[PDB]
């Protein structure tokens, strides 16, 4: 199936590793030029080198903190300078949380609000004008199954991912007039490096069977009884930003191996 | 994007016309063998001829009423004897309703229950064993935006589409162990022959501006301010049934141009 | 808080025991006249005697099967004959299921469709005209948390309760015209006789710790870690049908001790 | 129906006018002592006197901005000094928004985050320990129908109300162990002073029929074709915080006259 995105310019936040890098590789495979954004310069360089080598597309690296307005401004200026504008934006930079409401400091709430919600707000303000001028575009917000089905250990993440899912919907209705299609994807358990790190930490004192820990997580939460690979998730992002998904507007698509317990 | 559908056997109910026919074309383009199912065989012949001649695929026609156990039984036996079993099943046969609860006959409720729900129940019972023996497969239920956001004029359709959406989710958890992935797609406004007929009928005594009537429907319901084509919807069915959507289990995916008013 | 229902006529289906009887007690305590409906004649008569003597209200028994058109007809005519019409209707008659989709007979699907959905359809057609003529009323559908969050062992019940929840919503928008307010309540774990019977059956060969079995069900499903009493659930039904809940229209109210895992 | 809240201490944020004032009057009618909280001292002083005079309960005035940590701390300290602790908390202080995403300033996003979300976080942190020590309690978050069904003109309000609805759910699971029951209410169109002010502003140049403007808003959005009164809505708050609603945990209850378009 032709995706029709060859030569389009795709900005992916948090794309030096995990889901965001698999998304970038997915778009590059379809011939899209890539703007990679993350904090660490080294991983960003490898990601870009590998994408250009494997796929022969143009890749721009932007090494900034998208949780800050300065960082978002830098992404916008870099896109402008190298490409003029973006055709596709994926908001993916983020991380899990771990607290109780009774104990967490206000600054932690603020941190996740800036990272998960305000990055998406600021990136839309900053890149929508360019997208409009190019004749339209696609914007995806990678929220989480937790945006509707909260995990007990991470209330701050649950609340801010819920906010992001609503933001996606409100943005979709605002910019569809510009031929810009905005949607949300809500992943379930996706095997990424922090899950492995966590699995090791949590099994340090009971035998170190970190793969067993992960399997028990999957057994508890997902009828499919396994984690997804980032590549398998990335396919959905590529499809949703393609010329084949032109009636998808303001929707939330769960990719979760059965983990969502309700309709 | 490679779909990995070539040589797979896809059974599409209600595929002589409209959305089901567009789905069959979408699968044929990707090299799938097609089982077309509908009541009126003239349209089945025409559809099957076109698919064979345009796409070079094998097409089996089954002219039966899927709202009956006997019709379903014939579909199952036609598939087993011609192909061994199915890889893909798309439950699509259906039609809208038009009544009030206060006036509708019990028999009309029964008709939609048989057509929209029992067809899917009976096809799963009949086809899942063959699918299991083949190593897995994909089942999609084409319900509707009305399965969650009911349209005032068709309460029976709303209730039975809602039931179909829940059926999809229950079947998903029962059969995922067999590597059979079940999902639901809920379309919004899709321009099919019956919409054009209704438009012409509702405007016959006021100017015959049927295109104007359809535009007013789109303006009322969809932020994108147009109907989708069957072809644009069909892309989503092909993708969900492909090797690229292997983590989608028990999900409901709206394809509705913004029509869904909630998260 | 004054409920304003003294002297109102409340029809409760399935009210010779369990939740339905508790709802009838709740209404009787607020001075409503009661129409009790169930199949077993003596059980129903004794439930009626107890209400009448404990609460001093009028109680009318209709001993019929509400899954049949003839049973519903009898209810409507008994209400018309004794009271003129109803002010309140609670659709409650029902029972759980237990099957797989692969094994269940078509006849079992039909039974639950008639009992859970058509009973509500037929009672609305039969009773709404009298309620209209009385100046308005309240209709509640007792569905289940399973109408949105399906339990693995009972797919038929999940599908038909989902259908009922949608019916509630469609009826709500049809009759609000007439000052009839329709809503749905979705209960979680409610300790009724069949739960106790099941706990005793499933523990007969491992120590008979039936209370232990029920506690394990509560621990698995509900954050509150207990079942509700029917009486505690009944309060919500009485409130929703009162003069105090006059803006509740087309809503679904979960009363579930935290069991719903999503927003 | 006895609510069983006589002598309980209820803290209602934003309770000098509109919905919050109506909720305070509803709890006072049931014998509850009241903590009234709002910014404008004169209105608050007046409302407190009136309540004390009319219902003969204790009324504590705390004139602070609950969007600030200092304001929340002053509520917590005043409650501690006068009453020891709270039995009931209603998070109600808030206001609508009006902007586009493309035009709104970062500071406006922050303002609503602090007002609608952080107020509830901070008040929960501050009051839950006193509630736990008193043996349990009830907390309600007054979010909005917009938390799930966004209104086009107020994206910031929609996003922050959605965040609040998720916060309510996450808090509910964290504190049910303390016998503290947390729920969300999502009102539809409630006739409050700002609706009247808006209706006048918007009809200033087209005839001044502000009541007609409000009727058109209700006709557009609500099947019941009217606004609710704040007193109508307040009944639901009082009921949910009563001894009759003891199995309501982590639920969201819409009170919206049919405005929600989906299940
Ligand atoms: N993994 C999972 O199970 C699921 C993940 N998600 C969502 O997927 C998204 C990505 O997660 P995942 O791939 O697991 O995470 P990883 O930690 O593997 O990757 C996160 C990426 O984001 C970057 N990043 C983090 N913070 C910032 C920042 N402030 N500014 C710029 N870049 C940043 C990281 O690079 P660097 O540190 O150099 O900045 C890295 O490239 C997140 O939004 C997460 O919520 C949703 C559901 C499930
Ligand atoms: N069009 C739209 O805007 C939307 C449609 N849908 C759903 O899409 C599905 C397809 O509808 P659409 O393409 O619009 O309609 P069409 O009328 O164009 O296609 C319906 C197909 O179903 C077949 N069919 C109907 N009843 C039976 C039956 N008892 N047994 C076997 N085949 C049957 C019809 O052929 P025959 O009559 O010869 O049997 C025809 O092939 C339906 O389920 C509909 O509810 C959902 C949302 C929106
Ligand atoms: N208990 C629970 O945990 C939950 C229950 N529910 C729902 O609550 C409702 C009541 O259930 P519950 O109280 O537990 O069940 P019970 O079996 O304890 O009570 C059912 C009542 O309905 C009557 N009844 C059953 N079938 C019919 C029929 N065909 N016609 C007329 N009356 C009938 C029964 O009497 P008779 O047999 O004599 O006809 C009895 O009076 C059901 O709809 C159930 O699905 C929802 C969520 C949870
Ligand atoms: N009216 C409606 O149709 C709907 C309203 N709601 C929600 O209901 C809640 C009440 O709104 P409503 O009654 O309409 O509005 P009003 O403006 O009439 O009342 C708001 C109350 O909150 C107070 N308040 C506002 N900001 C603060 C603050 N920062 N700190 C302390 N008190 C504050 C106000 O007093 P002061 O200005 O002096 O501080 C006032 O007493 C809001 O959360 C709103 O979003 C939800 C759905 C619909
Ligand atoms: O979104 C999820 C799980 O789906 C969260 O648990 C994590 O924060 C995720 O980012 C993996 O670390
Ligand atoms: O859009 C979706 C995904 O299907 C949502 O509707 C979810 O089902 C949930 O947030 C509410 O139904
Ligand atoms: O699902 C829809 C449109 O959203 C139904 O109302 C129609 O009946 C459709 O099946 C074709 O008319
Ligand atoms: O029907 C009954 C009675 O056993 C319930 O237990 C259902 O399984 C379900 O509604 C529980 O919420
Ligand atoms: O919640 C609503 C209406 O449903 C918002 O439009 C406003 O903020 C309201 O609170 C003020 O009029
Ligand atoms: O997962 C099994 C399978 O047959 O399901 C249907 C897919 O089209 C096909 O690619 C896949 O191999
Ligand atoms: O005693 C219960 C009852 O149903 O018994 C039968 C009587 O006819 C009726 O009046 C009465 O309420
Ligand atoms: O709204 C009509 C009515 O009969 O509905 C049922 C309520 O119990 C009653 O108080 C009310 O007046
Ligand atoms: O529980 C969240 C919610 O919005 O889910 C959908 C239901 O309509 C409603 O009852 C419920 O409040």
mmCIF file with all atom_site columns, C-alpha atoms and ligand atoms in Angstrom, chain C residues 3-5 8 87-88 136-138 179 181 241-243, ligand 12:
data_model
loop_
_atom_site.group_PDB
_atom_site.id
_atom_site.type_symbol
_atom_site.label_atom_id
_atom_site.label_alt_id
_atom_site.label_comp_id
_atom_site.label_asym_id
_atom_site.label_entity_id
_atom_site.label_seq_id
_atom_site.pdbx_PDB_ins_code
_atom_site.Cartn_x
_atom_site.Cartn_y
_atom_site.Cartn_z
_atom_site.occupancy
_atom_site.B_iso_or_equiv
_atom_site.pdbx_formal_charge
_atom_site.auth_seq_id
_atom_site.auth_comp_id
_atom_site.auth_asym_id
_atom_site.auth_atom_id
_atom_site.pdbx_PDB_model_num
ATOM   1  C CA . UNK C 1 3   ? -37.907 12.758 47.240 1.00 0.00 ? 3   UNK C CA 1
ATOM   2  C CA . UNK C 1 4   ? -41.420 13.902 46.181 1.00 0.00 ? 4   UNK C CA 1
ATOM   3  C CA . UNK C 1 5   ? -42.554 10.444 45.215 1.00 0.00 ? 5   UNK C CA 1
ATOM   4  C CA . UNK C 1 8   ? -46.438 7.798  42.693 1.00 0.00 ? 8   UNK C CA 1
ATOM   5  C CA . UNK C 1 87  ? -45.102 7.261  36.982 1.00 0.00 ? 87  UNK C CA 1
ATOM   6  C CA . UNK C 1 88  ? -41.934 5.234  37.342 1.00 0.00 ? 88  UNK C CA 1
ATOM   7  C CA . UNK C 1 136 ? -44.230 12.718 32.791 1.00 0.00 ? 136 UNK C CA 1
ATOM   8  C CA . UNK C 1 137 ? -42.200 10.122 34.651 1.00 0.00 ? 137 UNK C CA 1
ATOM   9  C CA . UNK C 1 138 ? -38.917 8.329  35.088 1.00 0.00 ? 138 UNK C CA 1
ATOM   10 C CA . UNK C 1 179 ? -41.316 15.048 30.493 1.00 0.00 ? 179 UNK C CA 1
ATOM   11 C CA . UNK C 1 181 ? -36.647 11.118 31.997 1.00 0.00 ? 181 UNK C CA 1
ATOM   12 C CA . UNK C 1 241 ? -36.504 8.588  39.966 1.00 0.00 ? 241 UNK C CA 1
ATOM   13 C CA . UNK C 1 242 ? -37.210 11.443 42.402 1.00 0.00 ? 242 UNK C CA 1
ATOM   14 C CA . UNK C 1 243 ? -38.123 15.115 42.117 1.00 0.00 ? 243 UNK C CA 1
HETATM 15 O O1 . LIG E 2 .   ? -41.659 14.240 36.768 1.00 0.00 ? 12  LIG E O1 1
HETATM 16 C C1 . LIG E 2 .   ? -42.876 13.531 36.946 1.00 0.00 ? 12  LIG E C1 1
HETATM 17 C C2 . LIG E 2 .   ? -42.716 12.610 38.143 1.00 0.00 ? 12  LIG E C2 1
HETATM 18 O O2 . LIG E 2 .   ? -43.944 11.891 38.317 1.00 0.00 ? 12  LIG E O2 1
HETATM 19 O O3 . LIG E 2 .   ? -41.644 11.685 37.850 1.00 0.00 ? 12  LIG E O3 1
HETATM 20 C C3 . LIG E 2 .   ? -41.386 10.697 38.858 1.00 0.00 ? 12  LIG E C3 1
HETATM 21 C C4 . LIG E 2 .   ? -41.048 11.405 40.162 1.00 0.00 ? 12  LIG E C4 1
HETATM 22 O O4 . LIG E 2 .   ? -40.957 10.427 41.199 1.00 0.00 ? 12  LIG E O4 1
HETATM 23 C C5 . LIG E 2 .   ? -42.147 12.402 40.538 1.00 0.00 ? 12  LIG E C5 1
HETATM 24 O O5 . LIG E 2 .   ? -41.747 13.122 41.700 1.00 0.00 ? 12  LIG E O5 1
HETATM 25 C C6 . LIG E 2 .   ? -42.362 13.398 39.404 1.00 0.00 ? 12  LIG E C6 1
HETATM 26 O O6 . LIG E 2 .   ? -43.331 14.421 39.767 1.00 0.00 ? 12  LIG E O6 1
#
